[PDB]
């Protein structure tokens, strides 16, 4: 008769597996409304690890606390003004921290009470990966709506999702998440050395890359939030589950007792880096944004235009146009129609190659992703805590720092520009993003080699 208890903890785990999938998708939308540089979205994201460090039947209370955290995460939107077509993001930060609190006694006490009473971890993690695809599809459905929906006639909106300034309804994501957490809290109230470095220098890459994959697929390739969301949701997550299952299937398929698992970890890492260094050869050439990379006339890299030197237009505001030739100018003052110049069909076709390479990379990672815990008692806890703390808090911070080192035009808000980046010099974007990722991967690989040697 424990099956009801099992279903209760399953509904508990669904909320935790939904949380990150929600936050890292909301990060791109909550950067343009509060108009904050991309170095503080790192801190907002790291707040969720900050709370977990701070807090480091009863297993159910955390679910209601998380519902509270998510509802407080969305509460700023109701009690606030309108976003043009502040020191207020604090709530969001506080909110996220609250979330982390609930996350503390939920995951471990589950297995703890599970091993005492009466495979269970197996079936639980099997039914675990559901929430991610649910959340990815919800994000694909909500990244189609505005930010102040229910309060403005959508037809009077002029921005489009392919445009830069557009921001969706993230508060609804947090709201549905918190409501699900509250509901999942309802039943429990009635129910009764070198290896840590090796793994850190690999997990930091994954967390940063997930935090900024949408920034990449939106500024080098022409893919909005909805398409890239549902394409990872429908495709990449079932294959991730297939890899996680094949991990345990392989452990039984061949006896990888001690040297076998080491060889397998080296193998999965090498296959990862082998299928991950191909993003360079799928690279589409950068777009032409005059006045920021190339001068108004001629092709060379603030020497104002000869034609615009006479006109007394105003710098520092993004409202673009698309010349018939394929060059985008900053605003009609400086010079076809309102919008930008989308890339040729070449990049739109290359995006599917990007998708296939991403699927294959996540796959070849998922094989060792499960064997890692098999390889390594309190040391498990120390490794877990260290990777969580350092990766979570530090990855989006340094990633955002460098990505902010490559941002041509910014926005001004009454002072101190520090406005959300509204155009990226795409080649520098590729260099920085892929370079940090690849250098970190190889830094982990050399440690793998040293370990398997010893």
């Amino acid at each position: 008769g424990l099956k009801m208890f099992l279903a209760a903890l399953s509904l508990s785990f669904i909320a935790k597996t939904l949380g990150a999938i929600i936050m890292k998708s909301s990060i791109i939308h909550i950067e343009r409304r509060f108009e904050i540089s991309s170095s503080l979205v790192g801190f907002i994201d790291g707040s969720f690890e900050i709370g977990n460090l701070l807090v480091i039947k009863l297993i159910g209370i955390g679910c209601f606390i998380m519902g509270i955290g998510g509802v407080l995460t969305a509460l700023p939107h109701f009690f606030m003004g309108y976003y043009r077509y502040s020191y207020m993001w604090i709530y969001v930060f506080m909110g996220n921290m609250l979330r982390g609190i609930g996350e503390t006694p939920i995951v471990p006490l589950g297995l703890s009470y599970i091993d005492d009473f009466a495979l269970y971890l197996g079936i639980l993690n099997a039914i675990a990966m559901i929430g991610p695809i649910i959340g990815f599809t919800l994000g694909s459905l909500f990244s189609k709506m505005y930010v102040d929906i229910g309060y403005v006639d959508l037809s009077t909106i002029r921005i489009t999702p392919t445009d830069s300034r557009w921001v969706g309804a993230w508060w609804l994501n947090f709201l549905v998440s918190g409501l699900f957490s509250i509901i999942s809290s309802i039943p429990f109230f009635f129910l009764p050395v070198m290896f840590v470095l090796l793994t850190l220098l690999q997990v930091s890459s994954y967390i940063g890359a997930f935090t900024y994959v949408f920034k990449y697929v939106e500024q080098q390739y022409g893919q909005p939030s909805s398409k890239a969301n549902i394409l990872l949701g429908v495709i990449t997550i079932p294959i991730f589950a297939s890899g996680m299952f094949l991990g345990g299937y392989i452990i039984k398929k061949f006896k990888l007792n001690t040297v076998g698992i080491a060889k397998f970890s080296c193998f999965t890492a090498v296959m990862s880096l082998s299928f991950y260094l191909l993003y360079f050869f799928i690279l589409c050439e950068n777009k032409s944004v005059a006045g920021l990379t190339m001068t108004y006339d001629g092709n060379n890299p603030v020497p104002l235009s000869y034609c615009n030197s006479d006109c007394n237009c105003d710098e520092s505001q993004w409202e673009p146009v698309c010349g018939n030739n394929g060059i985008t100018y900053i605003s009609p003052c400086l010079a076809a129609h309102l919008g930008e110049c989308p890339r040729d069909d070449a990049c739109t076709r290359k995006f599917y190659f990007f998708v296939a390479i991403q699927v294959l990379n996540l796959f070849f990672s998922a094989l060792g992703g499960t064997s890692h815990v098999m390889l390594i008692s309190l040391a498990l806890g120390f490794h877990s805590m260290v990777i969580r703390a350092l990766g979570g808090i530090l990855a989006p911070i340094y990633f955002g720092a460098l990505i902010d080192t490559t941002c041509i035009k910014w926005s001004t808000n009454n002072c101190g520009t520090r406005g959300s980046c509204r155009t990226y010099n795409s080649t520098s974007f590729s260099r920085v993003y892929l370079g940090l990722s690849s250098m970190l991967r190889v830094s982990s690989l050399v440690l793998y080699i040293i370990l398997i040697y010893a």
């Epitope: 229910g150 309060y151 006639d153 037809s155």
Partner: antibody
Amino acid sequence: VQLVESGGGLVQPGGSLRLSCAASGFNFSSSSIHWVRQAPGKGLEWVASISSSSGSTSYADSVKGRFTISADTSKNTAYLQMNSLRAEDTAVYYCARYGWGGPWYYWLRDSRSGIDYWGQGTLVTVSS
Amino acid sequence: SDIQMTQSPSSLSASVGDRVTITCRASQSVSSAVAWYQQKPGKAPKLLIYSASSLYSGVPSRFSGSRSGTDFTLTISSLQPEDFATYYCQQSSSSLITFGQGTKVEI
């Protein structure tokens, strides 16, 4: 965005007639088109309604029946076919849409009230 | 139903920058679904206020509508030269509409 009515003339007392209203810019299906009348130098009044693709015919307790309100959803048109306009129907008929109501978080307690967009209309006066 | 609406004033003589208080009365079945329109000669009416509190996006912020008991009211905060027209108070419920005889302001 724009709603234009066409048809209407000086039909002799008795007989029938039909007026059409075309509109594009909004989903022509999910927009409760309404007909409203204004006699020469007098107040306004309501005539009929087609809430959606569904008929949902509803009329006025003074000239009910003699009118029929239909719609060609494929041809994005609203039709009002009238019979035996005797003397009181002389007016300047107007098409209209129930505009997007106020903020849809707390205006579900109150029903739909506003009327956003209006056509210029043309007379359907009737006399001998 | 049998929803009616009456409009007591018929010719007002407010001056520039005043607080005219045009008031309609709900005869039967107060529905809290009123709407106030404005009409100039030989033109098509526009929406000033709907549900007696909110406004139409584009309308000057002077116009203030309010609900009290059974007699809704419309106060023009301060008149202007582009305001002297006819004002209509309409009531609507579940696909039945009723209108009013209109207040005509003048000087």
